[PDB]
Design a protein around this ligand. Structure first.
Ligand SMILES: O=C[C@H](O)[C@@H](O)[C@H](O[C@@H]1O[C@H](CO)[C@@H](O)[C@H](O)[C@H]1O)[C@H](O)CO
Ligand SMILES: [Ca+2]
Length: 629
């Protein structure tokens, strides 16, 4: 039987759950897939509100699991995994085994450089450049009897708003699409949405392929998928709690635990350098695990031919602290129920856990906030690391990993999302490394939470950095990083980040006894509940400072290249963001947004982001369980 939970906060969870699953509120599509946000005029990570992400699915799993904990009904949780496997994990039709089985573990992919500006793309493929060996593919095909990968593609066009359809039919929904392809300077506003399954039916003469990659011959028809490691790890994290809570009530989610374990087995592809180069010696091709940094990199991707049989898989050289998940690693390496079927699954995750906690500590600033990360591929072309640059196992420190527009580590959210996982690990194991990290971090953030007299509040929103950490010496440990500093540029009231912050503080407080963390966590939850509720959950008015890019952001297109989006929009040099997404002009909020830009004002919105709403719900649940009195 489950332990008693605080009545007050349990009801707040059940209330939020009802608002989120309420058909009338519109958080889900008719197929049961959750949208990024109710509102459609949305550009921040995905560039359309009703486009979904693997991140949303993982939050959908977390939400339903907590629901199982209070209702004894886990059918919703099992349903979230069904929808996921059905719509976000490419099926046999989407990633044909005929092509995947032609994969060569000794030659995973063909090298192609990365550029610091979108106008340098397409990037030319170079077969002369070295590529290391894939050591885990044999383990996976052996344990699962297939060459297909079991991981979630990160972004989905739920209602086929772009018109690409399923496998080029132009009419089916949902639709597998991708956006980012051209380096650190390609913001959400500078992409060219493209289909994952490219049969050359849309876009240019060869689909969208020659916009990003330049080969010696004709681009072949091909499919490609990209994973968001932090999302798959969160799915494992959520499934673990669902399992625990189910067993406390004599119920079972056995089937879901299996899917999660398999997903976690495949997630190991994020442990490797993009083109499998040795960690700390990027000029050499790896011979196996000497190419594994054992951290959750920005992604891993795979693709293959549609008309001909061949395929490739790549990891990532860039590592951001915000993507790490020490808890998921603890689960997959120590819990017998989540032991991956592959020969080295559990042991690799054991190595990942230790490597991740070292990564966090190495990046902890003098104040307590965690710095960006590191890369094994300087400038994305395996260039010489500038002298004086600090390193972590041979990898150079990077302030804003992967993206610089805006800097990937200028958003406060990465702080709470990632530290919340450390807090869960600390709560469950009392691990000393986690404690040392949370004591300092929690003292920093507790001094940055501002409560106003009228009930509202503010927390860090945008942050900046100065300096770099001292080179990591495993046997030396944390030096204190006196020259690494964080600066809070501005504060705000982001309800998603505030909820995640509450979650983190609650787990930490429950284990450490730190009253300051507990009372701040409760004050946040109470403030949000009392002052920001609406019939759809919670919200607040926020400014959309980048929305002017809707009209003045030019999209780069290679000289001589012309194509059409499914709806007819012409793709050519000179086009702006809106020019290749003309349907946005039919959005209910379009006139209001444009009116504000004309009046020289900053547009404002009252948004209901799915992950934010779920974050608030879960935060209430966690508190009700850890502080039953
Ligand atoms: O870097 C700024 C952020 O992207 C903001 O636009 C926030 O959006 C969230 O950003 C994270 C990180 O990229 C996404 O994973 C998430 O889906 C976005 O909602 C925005 O202020 C809301 O928190
Ligand atoms: Ca840019």
């Amino acid at each position: 039987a489950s332990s008693p939970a605080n009545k007050v906060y349990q009801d707040r969870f059940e209330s939020m759950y009802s608002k989120i699953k309420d058909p009338a509120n519109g958080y889900f599509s008719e197929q049961g897939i959750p949208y990024h946000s109710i509102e459609t005029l949305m550009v921040e990570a995905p560039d359309y509100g009703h486009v979904t992400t693997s991140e949303a699915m993982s939050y959908y799993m977390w939400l339903e699991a907590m629901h199982g904990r209070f209702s004894g009904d886990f059918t919703g949780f099992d349903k979230s995994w069904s929808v996921t496997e059905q719509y976000l994990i490419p099926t046999e039709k989407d990633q044909p085994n005929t092509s995947m089985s032609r994969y060569d573990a000794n030659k995973p992919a063909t090298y192609a450089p990365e550029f610091q500006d979108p106008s340098k793309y397409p990037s030319p493929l170079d077969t002369s450049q070295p590529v290391g060996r894939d050591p885990i593919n044999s383990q996976l095909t052996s344990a699962y009897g297939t060459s297909m990968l079991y991981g979630m593609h990160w972004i989905l066009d739920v209602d086929n708003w772009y018109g690409f359809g399923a496998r080029a039919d132009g009419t089916s929904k949902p639709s597998y699409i991708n956006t980012f392809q051209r380096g650190e300077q390609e913001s959400t506003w500078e992409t060219i949405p493209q289909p994952c399954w490219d049969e050359h039916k849309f876009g240019g003469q060869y689909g969208f392929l020659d916009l990003f990659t330049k080969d010696t011959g004709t681009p072949a028809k091909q499919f490609k998928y990209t994973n968001a490691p932090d999302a798959d790890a969160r799915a494992v994290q959520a499934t673990y709690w669902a399992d625990q809570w189910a067993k406390e009530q004599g119920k079972s989610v056995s089937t879901s635990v299996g899917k999660a374990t398999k997903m976690g087995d495949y997630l190991r592809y994020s442990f490797f350098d993009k083109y499998f180069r040795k960690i700390g010696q990027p000029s050499q091709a790896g011979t196996g695990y000497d190419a594994a940094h054992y951290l959750l990199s920005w992604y891993y991707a795979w693709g293959g031919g549609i008309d001909s049989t061949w395929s490739w898989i790549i990891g990532s050289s860039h590592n951001h602290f915000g993507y790490q998940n020490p808890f998921a690693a603890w689960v997959l390496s120590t819990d017998a129920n989540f032991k991956p079927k592959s020969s080295n699954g559990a042991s690799d995750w054991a190595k990942s856990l230790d490597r991740q906690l070292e990564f966090y500590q190495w990046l902890q600033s003098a104040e307590g906030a965690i710095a960006g990360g590191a890369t094994n591929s300087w400038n994305g072309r395996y260039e010489a690391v500038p002298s004086g640059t600090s390193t972590f196992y041979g990898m150079g420190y990077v302030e804003n990993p992967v993206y610089a527009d805006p800097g990937s580590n200028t958003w406060f959210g990465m702080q709470v999302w990632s530290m919340q996982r450390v807090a869960e690990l600390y709560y469950k194991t009392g691990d000393a490394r986690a404690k040392k990290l949370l004591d300092k971090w929690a003292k920093w953030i507790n001094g940055e939470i501002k409560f106003n007299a009228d009930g509202t509040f503010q927390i860090p929103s945008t942050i900046d950095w100065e300096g770099q950490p001292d080179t990591w010496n495993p046997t030396q440990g944390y030096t204190g990083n006196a020259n690494l500093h964080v600066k809070v540029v501005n504060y705000g009231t982001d309800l998603g980040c505030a909820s995640s912050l509450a979650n983190t503080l609650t787990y930490y407080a429950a284990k450490s006894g730190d009253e300051t963390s507990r009372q701040n966590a409760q004050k946040l939850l109470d403030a949000m509940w009392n002052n920001y509720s609406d019939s759809k959950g919670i919200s607040t008015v926020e400014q959309r400072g980048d929305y002017h890019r809707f009209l003045d952001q030019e999209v780069f297109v290679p000289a001589g290249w012309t194509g059409k989006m499914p709806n007819g929009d012409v793709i050519k040099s000179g086009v702006k963001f809106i020019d290749i997404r003309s349907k946005y002009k039919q959005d209910p909020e379009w006139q209001t947004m444009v009116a504000a830009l004309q009046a020289g004002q900053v547009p404002t919105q009252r948004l209901h982001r799915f992950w934010a709403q779920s974050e608030f719900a879960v935060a209430n649940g966690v508190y009700a369980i850890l502080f039953p009195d």
